[PDB]
Amino acid sequence: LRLVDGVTECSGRLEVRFQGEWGTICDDGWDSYDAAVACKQLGCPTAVTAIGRVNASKGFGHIWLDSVSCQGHEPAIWQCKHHEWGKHYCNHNEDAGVTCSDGSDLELRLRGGGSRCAGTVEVEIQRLLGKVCDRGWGLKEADVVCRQLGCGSALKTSYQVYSKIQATNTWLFLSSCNGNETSLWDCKNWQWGGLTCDHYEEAKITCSAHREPRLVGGDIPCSGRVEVKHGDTWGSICDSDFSLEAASVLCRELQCGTVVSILGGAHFGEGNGQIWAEEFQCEGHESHLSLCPVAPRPEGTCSHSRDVGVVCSRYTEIRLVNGKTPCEGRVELKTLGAWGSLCNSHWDIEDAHVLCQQLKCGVALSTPGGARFGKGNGQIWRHMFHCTGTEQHMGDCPVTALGASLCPSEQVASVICSGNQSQTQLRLVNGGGRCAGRVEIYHEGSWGTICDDSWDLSDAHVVCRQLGCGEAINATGSAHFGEGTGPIWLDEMKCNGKESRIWQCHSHGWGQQNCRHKEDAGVICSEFMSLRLTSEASREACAGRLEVFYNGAWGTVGKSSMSETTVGVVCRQLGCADKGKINPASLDKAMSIPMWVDNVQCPKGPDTLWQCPSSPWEKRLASPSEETWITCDNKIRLQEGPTSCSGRVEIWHGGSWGTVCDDSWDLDDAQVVCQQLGCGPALKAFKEAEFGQGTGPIWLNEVKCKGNESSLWDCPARRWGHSECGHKEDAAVNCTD
Amino acid sequence: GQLRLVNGGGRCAGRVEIYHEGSWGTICDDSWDLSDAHVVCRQLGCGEAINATGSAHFGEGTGPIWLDEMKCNGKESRIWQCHSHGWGQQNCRH
Ligand SMILES: *[C@@H]1O[C@H](CO)[C@@H](O[C@@H]2O[C@H](CO)[C@@H](O[C@@H]3O[C@H](CO)[C@@H](O)[C@H](O)[C@@H]3O)[C@H](O)[C@H]2NC(C)=O)[C@H](O)[C@H]1NC(C)=O
Ligand SMILES: *[C@@H]1O[C@H](CO)[C@@H](O[C@@H]2O[C@H](CO)[C@@H](O)[C@H](O)[C@H]2NC(C)=O)[C@H](O)[C@H]1NC(C)=O
Ligand SMILES: *[C@@H]1O[C@H](CO)[C@@H](O[C@@H]2O[C@H](CO)[C@@H](O)[C@H](O)[C@H]2NC(C)=O)[C@H](O)[C@H]1NC(C)=O
Ligand SMILES: *[C@@H]1O[C@H](CO)[C@@H](O)[C@H](O)[C@H]1NC(C)=O
Ligand SMILES: [Ca+2]
Ligand SMILES: [Ca+2]
Ligand SMILES: [Ca+2]
Ligand SMILES: [Ca+2]
Ligand SMILES: [Ca+2]
Ligand SMILES: [Ca+2]
Ligand SMILES: [Ca+2]
Ligand SMILES: [Ca+2]
């Protein structure tokens, strides 16, 4: 037995001698055990044994064996089962070969991509280059390939072409891999060399640690400065290189839910280290940042005073603390920087389901009451979740803490859930809230409405009782909240008002109706909430007296201990700006509406005032000096300019600051901007980001101000909320001081 | 290795297109100045450049964008001889 025409003395085409002459062996039936016995027979290492002839040429003469089967026990090849000598039909393009190695000389890399863990799969076996064949290439094999290199799960069979890759002749053919072994070399029956990859492409792969994201520096679970890892090294991101879609993808990968806001500057503290120069181009629907396209720049980057930060929805920090097992005990959550136990008063089983689905262990069995699992360490939090049971995290549930009633002495929430992780209706729509809108009922695997015939407050009481919304204030019909689509399930509802569920009423029966969709029913319940700033000029202005809607009536909110964060939440909820200032009461005209709530303290997470803890609702008559008046900061600002009111234009919307593209930017729009800021006539309207690149998303494009509008949103704009623009074309203005 | 002008009403005016990687593509207008236009005109034998235009003055193109950030010094013989971010390295739109 001999090996010829190979890289070393331990690899090459295999030859056998008979009658005095050497001859070749056919590769059919030649498996890894045959190569193992061939390596063992010769004086060569046998730790790793592979099939195939490496860079060897075609055979010559007779083929003296075919379709052997050694099974690995027989010391020598000819002791195995084999066919008739010389009498076989293989041509000289099918000659066998063997590749024996110690196992410390085999190494595979990824080349052509943006990091260690994205590219074409290049293989180094005994200092000979190669590639892996597309034939049979799938994510299940890519998983072991990127497990051996030290990266995460494979995600795609492609990559971005960062650099060109040289050509190679050999090829590596891979059989099916079980998907759990810790190296590609451990896959069964992999061939090195021999066969050609005709009608097939090279193996490509992209895996998780290509662009792995992270959030650092925040005081709440799902907010902070954004950092990304390019395989091995971490780096911050410029606020001008990150978009709203990229933020959505980032917070989807990290399990933080939907994006609440992008924050520029260095909101969460300046970082240290590398700043990347890649502009993301996510379409929004990706699952990992690694899958997004990116545009690198060879030039320099921003300063560290422009690191992007993100705030996302899942800001609730909830846990089970005291109990026999880590998946049962008292429930605690931290807000306003302090831990506290929840209130049982409006805590039910559907909430426990999401509590222990968040913690990834089973489903809830019961909700023990009282001090059975421990008393609170101090003050009790009065938050009331309204989970529907189908969401995987508490931050996805509707929450309310504004005006919640004070709890009794020792009613504290607790939960017990099973360990088996494998364990796995009315809705109000179009009402501007959760406890108001058109009523839809889910009975036969589809959502349907209810007729307004015989529809009165008596049935609306049942509707607002089953959903967790208190009592009924309005029982509307005639499709007040818009026409529905789907079945009309119920008619002639005759609830007595004390029922607990809607179907317990003496209706005519499912599908027994004579209605159209213009007769869909709706409700407005007592727990409906709305916020308003009132002034004489307009009832929905951006500066005036603050009012809240509750129990069907409008009232005012006291100014006691009103912090900056609370006014920020108010302004952001109303859509005015990111922050505002309290004022002494105006003197134009004050209606005598009562006051609803006071002592409102908002944490840093929520973007609605309904989630801020406060004292319980209490209607009182109080002096106008105790009223809350707010002026929200301007919705448009000019930044980085040499004076107060010249520079780059930025606009607040959707919880984030952004910029205006310059595709149709002109002096007529600069007039509007300067007038809005209260500055003299416009002089120049710039283009192509004269005063530097912007922050956040591009909120506007092709604005069409006529030159006399009172604000930019009075102007027409064919684009609003989405733009085919980059940050390199931000608009700026120069006005008279 | 071919350079072409399209939609300009003549062979010595219009949108610039480069044939590479088996397809026609465009050049971004970022830093597109009179010197790069001079190089194009010299390559096509059309003399000295008079206008260098951007913002798709001759109409939005189709196909990939091949070169951004052209920094020709004005004396180059062929356009691809200039400094640039490389084939396909772009952050532009049509
Ligand atoms: C397929 O691959 C093997 C592995 O490289 C090839 O074997 C190598 O062939 C080259 C010729 O290109 C030999 O180079 C020569 O080496 C001697 C050393 O004394 C020197 O005198 C010559 O000037 C020349 O450099 C090389 O020795 C040989 N072996 C190794 C270990 O590199 C093989 O030829 C390829 N083809 C086939 C059909 O197997
Ligand atoms: C909800 O019901 C209230 C009354 O409980 C309605 O308020 C009245 O609205 C009418 C106009 O339709 C006014 O003339 C009255 O002054 C309002 N108050 C009272 C006490 O009658 C309210 O309009 C209803 N809302 C909806 C959406 O149906
Ligand atoms: C090509 O450049 C010339 C300048 O060399 C431009 O001609 C000027 O255009 C402006 C704007 O309409 C006029 O005010 C000037 O009077 C024109 N002449 C000169 C000598 O400045 C010409 O418009 C440019 N063409 C294009 C298509 O961009
Ligand atoms: C704005 O315009 C005034 C008046 O022309 C000029 O003095 C000033 O330098 C301009 N500012 C900038 C930043 O160009
Ligand atoms: Ca009716
Ligand atoms: Ca009724
Ligand atoms: Ca009816
Ligand atoms: Ca532009
Ligand atoms: Ca305009
Ligand atoms: Ca440009
Ligand atoms: Ca240039
Ligand atoms: Ca560019």
Model description:
Chain A is mainly β and 737 residues long. Chain A has 7 helices and 45 strands. In chain A, strands 39, 40, 41, 42, 43, 44 and 45 form a 7-stranded mixed beta sheet that branches. In chain A, strands 12, 13, 14, 15, 16 and 19 form a 6-stranded mixed beta sheet that branches. In chain A, strands 27, 28, 29, 30, 31 and 32 form a 6-stranded mixed beta sheet that branches. The A-B interface holds A 161, 279, 295-298, 724, 726, 728 and B 30, 85, 88-93. The complex binds a molecule of 3 linked components (NAG-NAG-BMA), a molecule of 2 linked components (NAG-NAG) (2 copies), 2-acetamido-2-deoxy-beta-D-glucopyranose and calcium ion (CA) (8 copies). One calcium ion (CA) binds next to loops of chain A. Residues 29-30 of chain B line the site of one calcium ion. Chain B: Residues 3-94 form the SRCR domain.
